[PDB]
Amino acid sequence: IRPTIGQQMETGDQRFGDLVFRQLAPNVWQHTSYLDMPGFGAVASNGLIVRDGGRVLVVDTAWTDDQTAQILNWIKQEINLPVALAVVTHAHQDKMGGMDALHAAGIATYANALSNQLAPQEGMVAAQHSLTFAANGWVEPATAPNFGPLKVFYPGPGHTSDNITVGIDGTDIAFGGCLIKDSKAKSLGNLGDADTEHYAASARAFGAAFPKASMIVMSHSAPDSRAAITHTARMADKLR
Amino acid sequence: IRPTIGQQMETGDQRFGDLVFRQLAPNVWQHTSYLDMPGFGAVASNGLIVRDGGRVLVVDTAWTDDQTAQILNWIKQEINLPVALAVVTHAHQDKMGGMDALHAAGIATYANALSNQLAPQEGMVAAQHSLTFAANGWVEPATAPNFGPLKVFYPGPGHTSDNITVGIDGTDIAFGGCLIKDSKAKSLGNLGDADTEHYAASARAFGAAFPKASMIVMSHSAPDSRAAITHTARMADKLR
Ligand SMILES: CC1(C)S[C@H]([C@H](NC(=O)[C@H](N)c2ccc(O)cc2)C(=O)O)N[C@H]1C(=O)O
Ligand SMILES: CC1(C)S[C@H]([C@H](NC(=O)[C@H](N)c2ccc(O)cc2)C(=O)O)N[C@H]1C(=O)O
Ligand SMILES: [Zn+2]
Numbered sequence: 001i002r003p004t005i006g007q008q009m010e011t012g013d014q015r016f017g018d019l020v021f022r023q024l025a026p027n028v029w030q031h032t033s034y035l036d037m038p039g040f041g042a043v044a045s046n047g048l049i050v051r052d053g054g055r056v057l058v059v060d061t062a063w064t065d066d067q068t069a070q071i072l073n074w075i076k077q078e079i080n081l082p083v084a085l086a087v088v089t090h091a092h093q094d095k096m097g098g099m100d101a102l103h104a105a106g107i108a109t110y111a112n113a114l115s116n117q118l119a120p121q122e123g124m125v126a127a128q129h130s131l132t133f134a135a136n137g138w139v140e141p142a143t144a145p146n147f148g149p150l151k152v153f154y155p156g157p158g159h160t161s162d163n164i165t166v167g168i169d170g171t172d173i174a175f176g177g178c179l180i181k182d183s184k185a186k187s188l189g190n191l192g193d194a195d196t197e198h199y200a201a202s203a204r205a206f207g208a209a210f211p212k213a214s215m216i217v218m219s220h221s222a223p224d225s226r227a228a229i230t231h232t233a234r235m236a237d238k239l240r
Numbered sequence: 241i242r243p244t245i246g247q248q249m250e251t252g253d254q255r256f257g258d259l260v261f262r263q264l265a266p267n268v269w270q271h272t273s274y275l276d277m278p279g280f281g282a283v284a285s286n287g288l289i290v291r292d293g294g295r296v297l298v299v300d301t302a303w304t305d306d307q308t309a310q311i312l313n314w315i316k317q318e319i320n321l322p323v324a325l326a327v328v329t330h331a332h333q334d335k336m337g338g339m340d341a342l343h344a345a346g347i348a349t350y351a352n353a354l355s356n357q358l359a360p361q362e363g364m365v366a367a368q369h370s371l372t373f374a375a376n377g378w379v380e381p382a383t384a385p386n387f388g389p390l391k392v393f394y395p396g397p398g399h400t401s402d403n404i405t406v407g408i409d410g411t412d413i414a415f416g417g418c419l420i421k422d423s424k425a426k427s428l429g430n431l432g433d434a435d436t437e438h439y440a441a442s443a444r445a446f447g448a449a450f451p452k453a454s455m456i457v458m459s460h461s462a463p464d465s466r467a468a469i470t471h472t473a474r475m476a477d478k479l480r
């Protein structure tokens with residue numbers, strides 16, 4: 001409802017069960033789910049839903065299996081196309097807590113190989129398939145077959161060592177997950193698993209990988225301008 | 241000759257210019273090079289040389305180009321066979337400081353894709369080829385072509401997020417690089433770039449990957465028993 005961390009609801013948001021959905025482009029929506037921590041309040045987390053070529057592609061789970069099943073039910077009601085695959089952007093609960101729900105639904109799942117290696121240690125179910133990356137950060141194409149417009153980029157260690165990012169070709173949208181914070185953020189969030197030496201370069205690498213995108217989507221704020229990238233990088237410069 | 245950090249010279253060590261070489265098995269030698277730190281003395285770093293029939297394989301550079309050129313000169317004098325390739329075990333100076341000497345010699349160089357992505361940020365030159373890894377840490381074989389007895393394993397983040405390890409097939413030797421400290425060590429060394437949460441599991445994963453290796457080679461101590469692995473993991477348990 002009214003998160004302690006994460007954006008508030010605004011015009012253009014559709015409530016569906018315990019989740020919120022917002023259309024960002026003709027074929028792209030943002031999903032938002034909430035983890036209610038007793039004595040603290042709710043923490044919102046955002047991911048994406050993309051319609052491409054008669055199928056739906058999901059970026060990130062919700063915090064829980066039940067919330068992720070609700071995402072799939074929203075897709076069934078609003079889009080009514082098969083969900084071909086999901087990409088999850090690192091091995092933490094806000095991005096991978098709902099993997100079992102995707103697997104039960106027959107959806108193929110993909111994550112950075114390192115995310116799958118870390119997953120059990122982080123309390124997560126690993127994805128079924130591992131993405132690997134060139135030294136320049138771009139996904140190795142044979143590991144990401146039939147990805148439609150999704151352009152998957154590993155920017156380097158930052159929020160975690162395994163964090164990946166996703167652009168949507170043909171749109172104005174790029175997704176930074178938990179790496180990118182908004183242009184008005186006062187902190188970089190949870191740095192407990194973070195690489196404070198390399199964070200700034202990784203944020204800048206994300207910006208340079210998706211130079212055209214004007215709508216920067218992220219895990220814990222509303223979509224922002226490219227100022228979110230510059231601000232995240234400058235905040236991260238202070239950690240070195 | 242007498243490092244402040246690293247093993248001292250014992251019987252069976254051959255001094256060659258500024259470096260020290262020790263035969264570990266009929267076809268395996270340890271190379272040792274020294275970085276003199278002003279007011280502190282020398283820090284030794286160890287890598288390996290492996291003969292595989294009519295060719296030689298190298299694990300890790302020395303600290304500098306000139307020291308690495310001396311490794312190549314020792315190989316020429318003592319073995320007199322071509323170096324087919326080198327594998328470097330993460331993007332820090334002790335393991336990658338001499339890349340330029342390998343390249344000048346025409347030696348094909350390999351590192352974790354992440355090491356190559358970090359190298360420019362660490363003041364290193366990237367290797368010319370990238371290794372990638374499965375979700376259980378084993379190298380993808382197509383990325384390690386014609387590696388002979390070198391069995392490359394990524395154990396998870398520990399000393400750094402990119403650290404890799406190498407078993408020598410057909411021997412009882414496995415190389416832990418800077419991840420593993422000796423059985424008598426009191427500290428884990430430089431933890432500035434370390435993953436303190438995952439270190440213990442990564443050290444144990446290295447041991448489980450090479451369960452019959454009885455001689456554990458590491459960057460800054462003489463070859464040790466498997467107690468190097470178990471003691472490293474025990475110290476790392478304390479970081480969590
Ligand atoms: C919004 C954050 C500060 S929390 C989240 C994440 N942690 C969890 O998913 C944990 N499971 C968790 C545990 C307790 C709790 O109350 C809430 C979350 C992380 O550690 O990165 N991402 C962060 C970020 O993007 O900065
Ligand atoms: C033996 C260590 C403690 S230093 C080495 C490495 N650092 C360097 O290569 C740096 N270039 C460097 C900078 C200043 C200096 O005085 C010496 C070395 C690292 O940071 O991991 N590996 C460590 C380890 O294995 O624990
Ligand atoms: Zn996270």
Ligand SMILES: [Zn+2]
Pocket residue numbers: 045094178219220
């Ligand atoms: Zn987050």
Ligand SMILES: [Zn+2]
Pocket residue numbers: 122193437
């Ligand atoms: Zn963690």
Ligand SMILES: [Zn+2]
Pocket residue numbers: 330331332399400418
């Ligand atoms: Zn190091």
Ligand SMILES: [Zn+2]
Pocket residue numbers: 334418459460
């Ligand atoms: Zn070292």
